[PDB]
Design a protein around this ligand. Sequence first.
Ligand SMILES: [Cu+2]
Ligand SMILES: [Cu+2]
Ligand SMILES: [Cu+2]
Ligand SMILES: [Cu+2]
Ligand SMILES: [Cu+2]
Ligand SMILES: [Cu+2]
Ligand SMILES: [Cu+2]
Ligand SMILES: [Cu+2]
Ligand SMILES: [Cu+2]
Ligand SMILES: [Cu+2]
Ligand SMILES: [Cu+2]
Ligand SMILES: [Cu+2]
Ligand SMILES: [Cu+2]
Ligand SMILES: [Cu+2]
Ligand SMILES: [Cu+2]
Ligand SMILES: [Cu+2]
Ligand SMILES: [Cu+2]
Ligand SMILES: [Cu+2]
Ligand SMILES: [Cu+2]
Ligand SMILES: [Cu+2]
Ligand SMILES: [Cu+2]
Lengths: 295, 295, 295
Amino acid sequence: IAAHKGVNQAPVPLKMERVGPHDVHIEMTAQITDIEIDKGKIYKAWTFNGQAPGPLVVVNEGDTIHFTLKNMDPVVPHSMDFHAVHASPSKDFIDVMPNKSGTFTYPANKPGVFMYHCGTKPVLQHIANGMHGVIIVKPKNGYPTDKEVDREYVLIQNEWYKYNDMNDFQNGVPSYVVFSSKALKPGDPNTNGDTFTLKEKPLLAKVGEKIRLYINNVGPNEVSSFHVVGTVFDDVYLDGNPNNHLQGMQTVMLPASGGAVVEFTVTRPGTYPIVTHQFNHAQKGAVAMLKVTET
Amino acid sequence: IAAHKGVNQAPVPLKMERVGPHDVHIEMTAQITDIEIDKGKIYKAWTFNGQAPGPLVVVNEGDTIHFTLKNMDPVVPHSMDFHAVHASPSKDFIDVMPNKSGTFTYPANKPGVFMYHCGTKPVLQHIANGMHGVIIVKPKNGYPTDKEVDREYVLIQNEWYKYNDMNDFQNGVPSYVVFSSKALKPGDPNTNGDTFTLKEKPLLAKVGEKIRLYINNVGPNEVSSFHVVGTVFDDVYLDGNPNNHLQGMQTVMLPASGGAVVEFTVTRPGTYPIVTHQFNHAQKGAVAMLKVTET
Amino acid sequence: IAAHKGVNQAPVPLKMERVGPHDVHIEMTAQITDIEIDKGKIYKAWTFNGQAPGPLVVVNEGDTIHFTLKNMDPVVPHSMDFHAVHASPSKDFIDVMPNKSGTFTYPANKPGVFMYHCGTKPVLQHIANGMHGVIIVKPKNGYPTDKEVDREYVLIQNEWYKYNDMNDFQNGVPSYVVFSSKALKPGDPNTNGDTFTLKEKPLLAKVGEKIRLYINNVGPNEVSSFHVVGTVFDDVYLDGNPNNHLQGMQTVMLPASGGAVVEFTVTRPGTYPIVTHQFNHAQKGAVAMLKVTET
Ligand SMILES: [Cu+2]
Ligand SMILES: [Cu+2]
Ligand SMILES: [Cu+2]
Ligand SMILES: [Cu+2]
Ligand SMILES: [Cu+2]
Ligand SMILES: [Cu+2]
Ligand SMILES: [Cu+2]
Ligand SMILES: [Cu+2]
Ligand SMILES: [Cu+2]
Ligand SMILES: [Cu+2]
Ligand SMILES: [Cu+2]
Ligand SMILES: [Cu+2]
Ligand SMILES: [Cu+2]
Ligand SMILES: [Cu+2]
Ligand SMILES: [Cu+2]
Ligand SMILES: [Cu+2]
Ligand SMILES: [Cu+2]
Ligand SMILES: [Cu+2]
Ligand SMILES: [Cu+2]
Ligand SMILES: [Cu+2]
Ligand SMILES: [Cu+2]
């Protein structure tokens, strides 16, 4: 796209504020930003806020979201679809033109770990170019295992293809498959989908802790066979809904856009890989690390 | 196949009648019929009754099915495998030769949303050429959420490949991935697996309704990441068995041949896309529409 | 690999002995062994004990495993990762050099049907070349349906690619997809992952029996849509954990490394195919047979 040549829009922070007991404002941008997806490989991603996946959003069950999208793309329209919400797609997930803003309002009344993404046709193109993310909706009454959890992180799986190549997006294998982590609390890492960051700078934990991961596989195209090496999931909540409670799973099947909350114990010091167990995808990048120490 | 050149057998209605409190007769054909799978693209499908997927069958839990297949194919044998039934494959799912009929009898004692398909070797060929469908077995005691449902439809996912090309069937990506709808009540649409019909003539609903979809992914080869844009599934019953009850799922993973009953609320007027969230497949056809109006 | 040319190490029996009420010794080899994966097609597999998948391991919930790997490979290091265990990957799943042995100790405190595999980088290579298997951990309190089961077998799904070809492992479709069976009791068959053995020498059962299968899809790369023709699963326990109990499933979705216990009734004499319902994979080998007779 001629109007994207040389464009690299600096990342913009997510803006969010609570405006009532059950109402929250969220302001995001659509922007074109160079991301290093593998060592030496730059992808001029289509993004929310200059991150791919986009920034984490966390709301409470029952919150209405008043969402604004500021489109900084010079030429392509963009939009937003939150899987958390009940909305009219053809009224509420509509396009925002270049250099314009749009505000849409909709309720999040289901707890869980939801995908969000651009909804502009062709949706495959917009998702594959980087316009995906996660929204977490925290359950009003928690999870039954909350009191057991010592530490928590967010992980997101996505794929990358040949740049802006619809034939490859539709017909080709992924070039890379990757994990990212998005911060829940100060000090947590906040990364983009690349093949290396979470190997070189592992997530951290302490021996004996029960870890919770909020996970989502945004695709665009693959399913995920999510596994943590050296442990078994004690508890799994499919899509993050507390009712969908499995126990003692080695591996969690996630559809494309599929989420879960998973909990596991790390019993011994060491480095614990986190993979999709579709090992072609692991080989193409989808291995993160969790470094477990005595402190 | 030389004996299929120029052959286009007009669709024949499904014949079904109840013959006792727990016994039903079903009569289907195997036939060769031209279907427009994408605009301008004709596939000379191998079909049941001139539809691909085939006609919907609905029986009650505990019904014995007395099934007749009339093979109108001039040269290829065909057969029938209902996933609903307990049967001897090597006695009851056997071939019916060209211009012959065969009758087989077997019980449907499990509720759910089951695939049916031709079982003639090579099964991949027969399924990929169009010989798939769904049988619904209604549970004796219903679903716990029945009283909440306002409207219901059947949707089926399938893929199409290069015509009668076993190399492509085994080794290639799908050319198209598609939804169809099959009628449960008079006035419901009844369509074939194509890339366009359910976009141009959306399924219809009213604002505020709870919708039930009976769904099955017949493959042959892909899994499905089933999602309705702008809502969350309130309730999911895997394979349509009332015991396999999930809640608040954004997306339902369906294996090949996998079914479900899913229920969701449409809260606002508008058009709601229905997708597999493996967006390469969505781009290749697998997007249906649900138009929601005030009336 | 020059040092594998002409190498064909005869299979070595698994060695296992109980050494306390809650402690077991297991001794396995890593070895290079020619396996006929399809008629006329030899793969010089990387194996545990000269089988691919490797030998079955069965322990009780709460057993600590004291595992020794004897590496008979002349040049490549190997390792062992049991998905059943809680362990430090970077201390306990480490490499054993050529012509050396290593012993690692770790507890199996979760019931189920777990993958095991070599964990040596690149893990894709080691798994794809044949270094996979299953460990079953029997639940302390059984499954609620135990008293109903008449007969049981183990089945494992794996794929085979072009020989030792990392490009194909990462980017290519499988050449073959296959089932194997591993013995639980004397007289049970014990086979390797090939396209033919379980078709020519079917698993055996009697009319009217309830059959339990312990199943795992080891991949490396594909998910599995597990189905038995002519029946419906009465009960399914995901990953073999008794809590993850589904009923009346036609088809069980297994992620890569995913397991289950499945139970079904064979009501009529005959031969019942067992498939992954991703029929491209079935066509490439993944069809086993269960021959059901009056005796
Ligand atoms: Cu309030
Ligand atoms: Cu507001
Ligand atoms: Cu966009
Ligand atoms: Cu979506
Ligand atoms: Cu792929
Ligand atoms: Cu703790
Ligand atoms: Cu664990
Ligand atoms: Cu009766
Ligand atoms: Cu009759
Ligand atoms: Cu046929
Ligand atoms: Cu089938
Ligand atoms: Cu495909
Ligand atoms: Cu209503
Ligand atoms: Cu909803
Ligand atoms: Cu004891
Ligand atoms: Cu010992
Ligand atoms: Cu190895
Ligand atoms: Cu593993
Ligand atoms: Cu494949
Ligand atoms: Cu019995
Ligand atoms: Cu059955």
